[PDB]
Each structure stands twice: as C-alpha cells, then as structure tokens.
Paper text:
In particular, MASP-2 CUB1-EGF-CUB2 (subsequently called MASP-2 3D) was crystallized in the presence of citrate that chelates Ca2+, and although Ca2+ was bound to the EGF-like domain, the CUB1 and CUB2 domains lacked Ca2+ and became partially disordered as a result (Feinberg et al., 2003). Because there was no structure of rat MASP-1 3D, and the existing structure of rat MASP-2 3D lacked two of the three Ca2+, including those Ca2+ that form part of the binding site for MBL, both rat MASP-1 3D and MASP-2 3D were crystallized in the presence of 2 mM calcium and diffraction data were collected. This resulted in one MASP-1 structure at 3.7 Å resolution and three independent MASP-2 structures at 2.6–2.7 Å resolution. For MASP-2 3D, 279 of 280 residues were visible. Interestingly, the three structures overlaid closely, with RMSDs of 0.682, 0.871, and 0.992 Å over 276 Cα atoms. The only notable differences were in the N-terminal seven residues and in a loop within the EGF-like domain (Thr125–Ser130), probably reflecting flexibility. A major difference, however, was that the structures now contained three bound Ca2+ compared with the single Ca2+ in the EGF-like domain of the earlier MASP-2 3D structure. In the MASP-2 CUB1 domain, Ca2+ formed contacts with six oxygen atoms in the side chains of Glu48, Asp56, Asp101, and Asn104 and the main chain oxygen of Ser103 (distances between 2.3 and 2.7 Å). In the MASP-2 CUB2 domain, Ca2+ formed contacts with five oxygen atoms at the side chains of Glu215, Asp225, Asp262, and Ser264. The firm identification in this study of the three Ca2+ sites in rat MASP-2 now resolves a key ambiguity of the earlier rat MASP-2 structure (Feinberg et al., 2003).
Author numbering:
A (entry chain A), B (entry chain D): 1 to 278
Write the structure that this text describes.
C-alpha cells in the first residue's frame, strides 16, 4: 500500500553543451530510496586528456569507494573515458565530482550524464555462495523477504528456517525415528522433541543405526548441537562426534528424545531404531 | 604456575594508531591453559564500513565457530562494530583475524584489542546442562573438585558420593530396615550391608511393606541394582522390578541383607519389616 518514489535526473558540466571554463568545481550527491541503487551513464563526454586524469576529471564515488576517475574522449591505457559503460552506486548514494584546472589548450565540451534508481536484487546480485536466506529468498521493490519449505517456520531472525520436529508422539512400539532431512544436513536453530508413550509394564530399547554426525568441539563435548535421551527415572547423553553410539536399554515404557541445533553447520544427523519387550 | 602465553595481552592492527594499509593480513591464535577461557574486547575500533564487512574486517573465531565479523565504527543493520561488547572463547583458545582490501579512501585507524584469561567455573552452570558433582561442587582457579555430605564418601571416580550403609547390626527382635534415604532415591555406587543376629532356635520373617523401586532389565532381572537376602541355610534374590515382592519366611536366626547400586538412577528403594517366632 506504500510504494517507492522514483528517482532520476540529469547532470551536466557548467555551460553544457558550450565549452566549460577553467578553475571550476562542482559536486552532486545523488540518493536513491532504501533498497535501491543508482545507475549512471554518459550521453556526452569530452574532457581534457591527462595522465591519470590529473588535470580535468569527473570522479564517481560511492560509499567508501571511488567508482571511477574519468577524463579525455576515448579510454586509453592509463585513463578511462566512460563510453557506453554503466556505473552503479554501492548502497543508495552516489557522489559525482567535476573539476577543471587552470587551462584548456582545446575547447572541451564537458559532459552530459543521466541517472536513475533501480531496485537492488538482494537474492541474485551481491551473491556468491552467500544467499541471505536459508530456504527461499524473495526479491521485491525496496527489499527482500525470506520464507521456508513446508514443515518449517521462519525464525525470529527472519532468515533462518526452524524445523517443526517436536510433537511426534509414537505409540507403535517397534519403529524408526530421526533428525530432520536425514541423511541431509539437519536445520539450524531447531528444537526437536520426540515422545514414545506406550502402555504401562513395558520396557523400551533404543538403537542408533547407519550413520551418525553431530557437531563436536575439539576439547569440550557437545555445546553446540545437543542430542539427549530421557526416561522418567534417568538421563542419557549428549552424543556428538561422528561415531555411532552404543546401544541403550531403558526400564521405562515412556521415553523422550530431544535434539537441539545451533546457528551453523551442515552435519547429517542421526537415526534411531527402537524395539520392545516385557 | 607457568604457561608459554601470558594471562593478559594486547593486539593491534598493523601500524596502529596510524592508518592501516592495503592488502594486509594478520592472524593471532591465543591459547589459555586447560580450565581457563579467554576474554577479548576492543578499546579502539575504526575500520572501513562495507556491506557484510566484505572489504575490511576483523573476524573472531573459536573452535569451529565464528564469534564475530566486525567492521566500521558503529554497528548498522547488516554490519557490526564491537562497541564495548566482550567476546568469550569456547574452550581455552581463540583466533583473531585481520584483513584489509585494495584501498582505503579515508584514514581508517584500525583497532586496539585486549585479552585476558579467566577461570572457568565448572560448578556454576547456566544449569540447562548437568551438575558435575553428586553432592558438593568446589571451584578453584584452573579447576574443580567434588565432596560429599556427612555419612557419605567420595567414590573413586571423584564425582559420585557412596553411602556409608554398612555396619548396621540389629539384635532387636522386631524391627524395620531400609535402603538409604528412603523413600528418597537411593544413592549411587553404594554397597549396603545389614546384619540380623538373633538367638538360636528362633526364626525370622521378612516383609516388604511400602514402596518398592529397584532398577530392572527388559529381558534380564537385576543386573544393575541388586538386593539379596542370605540366611545360613539359603539365599534369596536378587529382587528388582517395581512391584512389592511376596513375603519370605526364614528358618535361620542369622540373616544378612546386601544392597548394591550402580552409577545411575533415581529409584526410591525399599523397606523391610522383620518379625520372629519359634
Ligand atoms: Ca583543463
Ligand atoms: Ca529488492
Ligand atoms: Ca550445528
Ligand atoms: Ca579497505
Ligand atoms: Ca575453575
Ligand atoms: Ca540405579
């Protein structure tokens, strides 16, 4: 219900299209709305040529960086003329500076430049392996939004996808149980809780199977990702490393398994096969 | 004691407090002794600001985790400056990494950081984790040690408190007898021994009376906690499970009850009322 305002304009050297004079200094600060960057190009460029544009120049800077230093008419080995190149602001702001020195041996016409704001694509551009979203990144005008696959919920940090893996209440007495996505990497910032609740007088036995991969610390044990098992009379765990933990035999009919994950890592996780006797 | 690295120290960007240069890379690995962690903070911080600190940064890592990525002077929406924040190592080690890219358009002054070792308090958990001691936990500089309540003795594992429940010699003809702390959970790694010595020609009768709770096995009987009874003419037990066992009638004037517990469990235990006839 609220939309960005357009931002666009035209910049010229003093007196354009007539020849620019000596000892002139101009600067324009251009600012796009949040989520936008600026796009600038030159329809006309004809300045005094000099080594590294020491005499006359047009300087484009953005944020903390110098985007370009331009002079002459056609780009050389150590100088740059803009040609049909396009220049982009870093962030929403862009400064344009024009300077002429004490003399022009020829009648130089200066420059005509045009600029326009365009939406930043936070999902595709400024992207290496670093996607700002855990699952789905949605670009829109002036921003972006994150969403998650089914069976997840967006964390409060608005980027991480937390599994909905609590609430599983098993009553079938022989069965399997697992970390999310296994054997794919288990999700970040998740709190899983699995409850085996069956008839009284029965005793359960739990078995880890196949592969095991939980984030470990060099000299500490399991401070990051914590996998623990709980009978109403006793506690077991936490299990880490990359070796399948030994069998466990419970006295109780009701058992609770909890799996907690922290903000980082791509570890595969765990399987558990539980059986039964009297 | 003595350690190769000092209890306190100072790290600065190359050339501090003068402007740092381009294409610079530094890394310091700081390591405290076991039982200590490292605490690091910044007295001065002024780096080039960039989206996600891609240009210049200080990265604090510990173990496998990145504690922080820092740039700028004051923290923004997607960037972090340390301010007066304190950073803590996970375990005794902590790595500091400094990097600068190809240019500095302003005189960025870099950073001054200080670190100090501090004792880990193994006794004071956030207590979402377990307590390392059975009874009393004592913290000291560089370590901790355990102790027990009166009537107990510290087990060889230096953490578990074993009850002193041997030595009870009953001569009274009618009476009660019990697992330690009943009806509170009976202690771990304890070996209790109760001796009933009565006049010749008399016969004792034993009765479980209130609650009965001893660690049971799925398909076996009593391999963890073992409660056994011994007359000079017979042996009874071991008794486990969680149902009050039937009455027992001894021929002997002499009875010895032995109760053994394992390293884990919170089971309540047992009472026994014994009487006598001719
Ligand atoms: Ca000139
Ligand atoms: Ca956008
Ligand atoms: Ca993790
Ligand atoms: Ca830099
Ligand atoms: Ca300590
Ligand atoms: Ca026990």
């Amino acid at each position: 219900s609220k939309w960005p305002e357009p931002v666009f304009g035209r910049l010229v050297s003093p007196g354009f299209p007539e020849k620019y004079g000596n000892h002139q200094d101009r600067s324009w600060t251009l600012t796009a709305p949040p989520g936008f960057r600026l796009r600038l190009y030159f329809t006309h460029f004809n300045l005094e040529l000099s080594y590294r544009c020491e005499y006359d120049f047009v300087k484009l800077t953005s944020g903390t960086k110098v985007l370009a230093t331009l002079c002459g008419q056609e780009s050389t080995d150590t100088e740059r003329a803009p040609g049909n190149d396009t220049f982009y602001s870093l962030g929403p702001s862009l400064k344009v500076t024009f300077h002429s020195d004490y003399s022009n041996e020829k009648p130089f016409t200066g420059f005509e430049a045009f600029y326009a704001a365009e939406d930043v694509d936070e999902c595709r551009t400024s992207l290496g392996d670093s996607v700002p979203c855990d699952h789905y990144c949605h670009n829109y005008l002036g921003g972006y939004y994150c969403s998650c696959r089914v069976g997840y919920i967006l964390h409060q940090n608005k980027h991480t996808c937390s599994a909905l893996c609590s609430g599983q209440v098993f009553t079938g007495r022989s069965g399997f149980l697992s970390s999310p996505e296994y054997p794919q990497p288990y999700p970040k910032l998740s709190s899983c809780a699995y409850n085996i609740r069956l008839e009284e007088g029965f005793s359960i036995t739990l078995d880890f199977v196949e592969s095991f991969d939980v984030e470990m610390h060099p000299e500490a044990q399991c401070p990051y990702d914590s996998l623990k098992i709980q009978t109403d009379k006793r506690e077991y765990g936490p299990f880490c490393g990359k070796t399948l933990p030994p069998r466990i035999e419970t006295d109780s009919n009701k058992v609770t398994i909890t799996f907690t994950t922290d903000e980082s890592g791509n570890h595969t996780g765990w399987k558990i096969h539980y059986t039964s006797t009297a």
